[PDB]
């Protein structure tokens with residue numbers, strides 16, 4: 001019963017209502033608006049909740065799902081790279097997980113700069129990329145890892161671990177098993193880096209807005225939300241958090257498209273069922 005078609009239909013019904021309620025109006029006070037004529041939103045109808053926005057010129061949100069704290073964002077536009085790097089550095093980012101594939105990044109029509117696999121200078125910020133490990137996730141899917149060193153006069157230099165799912169499929173979802181492996185890798189990578197900051201006495205450890213994993217695909221609502229949901233199920237502090245709760249939390253804190261596709265919700269439901277976690281709130 002709890003994972004049957006009726007329960008699943010009720011879950012989808014609740015979530016569809018929420019998506020509709022959260023749809024952005026023109027100049028919606030709930031959503032971040034572009035300053036002037038520079039593009040803010042990569043996709044016109046995928047907007048950034050104002051109250052949880054990380055920076056005034058990025059489409060990026062703080063999200064807390066149960067006890068699990070992250071940042072979800074869109075793939076930065078070329079014009080946003082300096083601001084995006086400053087976000088990454090100021091956050092003392094313990095892991096950046098990029099779920100857009102190499103093939104997507106190479107597709108010039110998508111306007112996704114290869115900002116983490118190449119070195120470059122963006123305004124005042126210079127960035128160096130180095131390749132590190134490669135970790136298989138299952139089904140031939142590979143996580144390629146990097147360290148991104150971000151340098152800027154007047155700022156402390158920050159190095160950010162990157163997990164890039166370079167061969168993420170482009171028109172289907174990855175399985176629950178691959179998602180679980182990816183969530184574990186991302187969480188573990190973050191824990192190692194967070195620990196380094198704690199050992200050094202960084203003030204960021206005490207700041208709820210910092211030390212957050214940063215996750216994006218192209219829009220930051222599909223693959224990204226599937227991963228964030230899996231991460232929250234990987235956190236033993238989140239007992240009794242339902243699938244309804246987690247998807248509602250993501251939507252209210254970013255936008256109504258979080259968990260964009262039914263295929264992605266299917267994975268979250270399967271992960272929840274494996275844990276005996278509820279789908280719905282009573």
Ligand code: VO4
Nearest residue numbers: 092156202203204
């Ligand atoms: O500027 V710190 O995040 O090393 O206290």
